């Protein structure tokens, strides 16, 4: 049955618009296969289209906004794009139609509606770009009956091992097609849909924009050679219409030119399924997806007071849909330093300098290929897997569809190497590398990242401990406990590998110093830190011991090990791995003690990181902020704990962490408040705030001395965080990376969906 569900999930999730790095396109979860991409741009002159054409996601003054209104990876959804430069409001509806043996069929409707400021007679060029990679596969444009192009639909017929036989149809669409009276029309036609079928070596097919432009340049060169000139030039839109030349190849360019509003459909028909997909199929299946989307949301994301109103419902749908709509499939080689240079051990004072020298050897090389199916923080700026981000992304996603979340976790864990390392930033293939300066591509096998994916596993375990085919499949791994357990059974070794890996590579040093503590074992130090940064912790510029030092201990890291060990206890125990559960219990106990012995400041009333003095003694270094609260944030303290009580005071203290907009990353009293790049040195970040809220609720709904403070802080923090993110969404249309504690303004990057989307689950409550 486990095997059976896997196959059914496989088949359900195969197709999607799994290209979140571009405005609109599709690919299945297969490295070397069939991909599609949308491009459009207005044309007003002989030289503007190169500047106006849209393809890869960006965000600037020319673009008002864009995103998913509704989305489910099993079903499809609807995306709207508001493009200022091109005076266009676009809608891209996509839908999956199950059947056959190759992962079903799909359709999409591209609708462009000019806005009020656009010339009513604007010419918009639209391209649908189709590529296919693989050795033993074919794809061909059925030729037109007409001389110069297509009056009606474009039919591509194709075949591969993975997809079997299929056809892909670009419909004629609705809208005015401009007509040219020029002499050129005798050779190029008056104006009509055109197709160019080309061949490039497979590994460059992703480069759709240069491939298209090469064709346009060549058409223009032909005009020049053939005496079309400035005495009597064809109109721009005809100069930029490709000579129709359909045939065989691994690239197919389908080009339409419209005057005013337009729409057209894409129909993908898997031959092994029943009849081919039609535009009436599309319309109906879109209406149906909306309905199911609506019904699922009201159930899964039932927003509690005071967010039960419609304004917040719309907000929630937008935040949720953008987060789950970010899901992509990535495939290819990564850049990794496999030297394991000894300088990376950071065992001496001044290690950052040695580590730099090693990096300057540039031993990194490409390896793989790898695949990853994951949600992402940022479509415009970094559309790719980030390890601790994903832990946050999947919390709302698991609510929606635990089986999808398990799938994403599985995908991440399949990256893990023999030693137990997963790169914290997954840059898979040349398309992905195009977004990243070469200088920042290289992953380091000694760089950890918070293991927040355990939090998702935690939530699955509690769900395990306590309809349409799609609805069925979404919860199959909880409803069928045998299946849940087999999944955990298979993942459990890699979890332990990771745990062991943290203990081997991220080890702090007690024994070499005047350090005493309940345990000589439990002590941790993030590898990879520089004078100003600690990227691997995820809190980039949060203030840490100065200077960095091999004797550092980091209270956040130990807390994460604490998270992993509690998770190992629950998972081990479901699998009766008795001897390990004994090992885990001994570790947890040592951490609880060593958190106090090594990290607690009775003086400051919070946890602190620790270094080694110029006199070689263990010195606490206290920077009141997120780090300070870690044992609490990660659920490690007893609800009666006096330490927790002092942390509650710090959290609620306005002069320290408590802004009207949420918890400040760093206290206003801290000497480093607002300094440097001020990334994690004051702003309000949603992911840590989410953790505080969850922990306040836990205390609030349980007997103890702080139940009542916890309740007030929960109530208020939930309110401040949600309302801040809502307020900014209402005014700007965006989720932001972080929020200003002075003004409440969203700042840094937009389209951060992204852990800002946690706000949908904060509104939902009932933890
Ligand atoms: O492609 N660009 O044009 C481009 C590339 C990049 N660089 C990508 C570098 C990786 C970001 C990590 C964020 N990061 C922060 C950490 O603090 C979290 O802990 C960490 O996990 C998350 C992970 O999301 C930035 C911009 C940009 C543009 C305009 N405005 C602002 C920024 C644009």
From TrEMBL:
Q: Where in the cell is it found?
A: Endoplasmic reticulum membrane
Q: Could you provide one GO biological process annotation from this protein's UniProt record? A: protein N-linked glycosylation
Q: Does the keyword Mitochondrion apply?
A: no
Q: Name one GO cellular component term.
A: endoplasmic reticulum membrane
Q: Which reaction does it catalyse?
A: N(4)-(alpha-D-Glc-(1->2)-alpha-D-Glc-(1->3)-alpha-D-Glc-(1->3)-alpha-D-Man-(1->2)-alpha-D-Man-(1->2)-alpha-D-Man-(1->3)-[alpha-D-Man-(1->2)-alpha-D-Man-(1->3)-[alpha-D-Man-(1->2)-alpha-D-Man-(1->6)]-alpha-D-Man-(1->6)]-beta-D-Man-(1->4)-beta-D-GlcNAc-(1->4)-beta-D-GlcNAc)-L-asparaginyl-[protein] + H2O = N(4)-(alpha-D-Glc-(1->3)-alpha-D-Glc-(1->3)-alpha-D-Man-(1->2)-alpha-D-Man-(1->2)-alpha-D-Man-(1->3)-[alpha-D-Man-(1->2)-alpha-D-Man-(1->3)-[alpha-D-Man-(1->2)-alpha-D-Man-(1->6)]-alpha-D-Man-(1->6)]-beta-D-Man-(1->4)-beta-D-GlcNAc-(1->4)-beta-D-GlcNAc)-L-asparaginyl-[protein] + beta-D-glucose
Q: Would I find Endoplasmic reticulum among this entry's keywords?
A: yes
A single GO molecular-function term is: Glc3Man9GlcNAc2 oligosaccharide glucosidase activity
Alphabetically ordered keywords of this record: Endoplasmic reticulum, Glycoprotein, Glycosidase, Hydrolase, Membrane, Signal, Signal-anchor, Transmembrane, Transmembrane helix
Enzyme Commission identifier(s): 3.2.1.106
* Disulfide feature: 608-622
What is this protein called in UniProt?
Mannosyl-oligosaccharide glucosidase
**Native organism:** Chaetomium thermophilum (strain DSM 1495 / CBS 144.50 / IMI 039719)
């Amino acid at each position: 049955l486990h095997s059976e569900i896997g196959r059914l999930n496989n088949q359900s999730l195969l197709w999607g618009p799994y290209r979140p790095n571009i405005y609109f396109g599709t690919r299945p979860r297969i490295g070397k296969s069939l991909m599609t991409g949308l491009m459009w741009g207005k044309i007003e002159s002989y030289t503007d289209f190169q500047h106006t054409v849209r393809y890869t996601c960006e965000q600037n003054e020319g673009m008002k906004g864009y995103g998913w209104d509704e989305y489910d990876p099993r079903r499809g959804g609807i995306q709207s794009i508001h493009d200022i430069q091109n005076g266009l409001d676009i809608t891209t509806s996509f839908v999956k139609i199950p059947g056959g043996a190759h992962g079903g069929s799909w359709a999409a409707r591209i609708k462009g509606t000019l806005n009020d400021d656009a010339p009513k007679d604007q010419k918009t060029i639209v391209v649908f770009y189709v590529s296919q990679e693989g050795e033993n596969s074919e794809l061909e444009a059925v030729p037109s009956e007409n001389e110069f192009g297509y009056e009606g639909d474009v039919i591509l017929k194709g075949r591969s091992e993975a997809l079997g036989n299929y056809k892909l149809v670009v419909t004629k669409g609705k809208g005015v097609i401009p007509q040219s009276d020029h002499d050129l029309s005798r050779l190029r036609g008056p104006g009509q849909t055109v197709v160019q079928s080309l061949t490039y070596p497979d590994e460059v097919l992703w480069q759709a924009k240069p491939i298209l432009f090469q064709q346009l340049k060549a058409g223009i060169d032909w005009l020049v050679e053939n005496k079309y000139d400035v005495a009597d030039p064809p109109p721009p839109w005809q100069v930029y219409l490709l000579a129709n030349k359909p045939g065989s190849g691994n690239v197919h360019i389908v080009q339409k030119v419209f005057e005013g509003d337009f729409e057209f459909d894409i129909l993908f028909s898997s031959e092994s399924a029943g009849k081919e997909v039609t535009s009436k199929d599309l319309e109906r299946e879109v209406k149906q997806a909306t309905e199911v989307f609506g019904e699922r949301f009201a159930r899964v994301f039932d927003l509690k007071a005071p967010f039960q109103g419609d304004n917040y419902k719309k907000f929630g749908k937008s935040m949720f849909s953008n987060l789950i709509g970010g899901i992509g499939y990535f495939y290819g080689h990564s850049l990794v330093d496999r030297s394991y240079a000894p300088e990376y051990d950071e065992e001496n004072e001044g290690f950052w300098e040695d580590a730099a020298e090693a990096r300057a050897r540039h031993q990194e090389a490409l390896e793989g290929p790898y695949e990853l199916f994951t949600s992402i923080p940022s479509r415009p700026f970094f559309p790719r897997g980030f390890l601790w981000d994903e832990g946050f992304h999947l919390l709302p996603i698991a609510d929606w569809d635990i089986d999808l979340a398990l799938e994403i976790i599985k995908s991440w864990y399949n990256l893990m190497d023999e030693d137990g390392w997963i790169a914290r930033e997954q840059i898979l293939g040349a398309e992905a590398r195009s977004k990243v300066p070469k200088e920042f591509q290289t992953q380091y096998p000694h760089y950890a990242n918070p293991p927040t994916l355990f939090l998702v596993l935690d939530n699955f375990v509690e769900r395990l401990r306590k309809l349409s085919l799609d609805e069925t499949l979404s919860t199959a791994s909880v409803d069928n406990p045998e299946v849940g357990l087999e999944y955990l059974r298979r993942l459990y070794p890699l979890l332990r590998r990771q745990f062991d890996w943290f203990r081997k590579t991220q080890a702090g040093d007690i024994k070499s110093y005047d350090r005493e503590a309940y345990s000589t074992k439990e002590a941790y130090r993030w590898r990879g830190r520089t004078v100003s940064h600690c990227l691997t912790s995820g809190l980039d510029d949060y203030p840490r011991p100065q200077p960095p030092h091999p004797g550092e201990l980091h209270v956040d890291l130990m807390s994460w090990v604490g998270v992993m060990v509690k998770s190992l206890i629950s998972i081990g125990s479901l699998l009766g791995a008795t001897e390990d559960v004994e090992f885990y219990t001994k570790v947890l106990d040592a951490i609880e003690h060593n958190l106090d012995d090594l990290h607690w400041s009775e003086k400051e009333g919070c946890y602190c990181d620790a270094t080694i003095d110029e006199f070689e003694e263990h010195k606490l270094v206290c920077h009141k902020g997120y780090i300070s609260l870690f044992p609490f944030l990660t659920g490690l303290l007893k609800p009666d704990s006096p330490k927790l009580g002092k942390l509650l005071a710090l959290i609620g203290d306005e002069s320290e962490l408590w802004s009207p907009y949420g918890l400040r990353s760093l206290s206003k009293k801290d000497e480093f408040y607002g300094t440097a790049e001020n990334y994690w040195r004051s702003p309000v970040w949603i992911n840590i705030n989410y953790l505080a809220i969850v922990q306040l609720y836990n205390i609030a709904t349980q007997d103890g001395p702080y139940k009542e403070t916890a309740r007030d802080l929960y109530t208020r923090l939930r309110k401040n965080i949600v309302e801040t993110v809502y307020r900014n969404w209402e005014e700007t249309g965006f989720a932001w990376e972080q929020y200003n504690p002075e003004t409440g303004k969203g700042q840094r990057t937009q389209h951060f969906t992204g852990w800002t989307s946690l706000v949908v689950k904060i509104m939902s409550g009932h933890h």
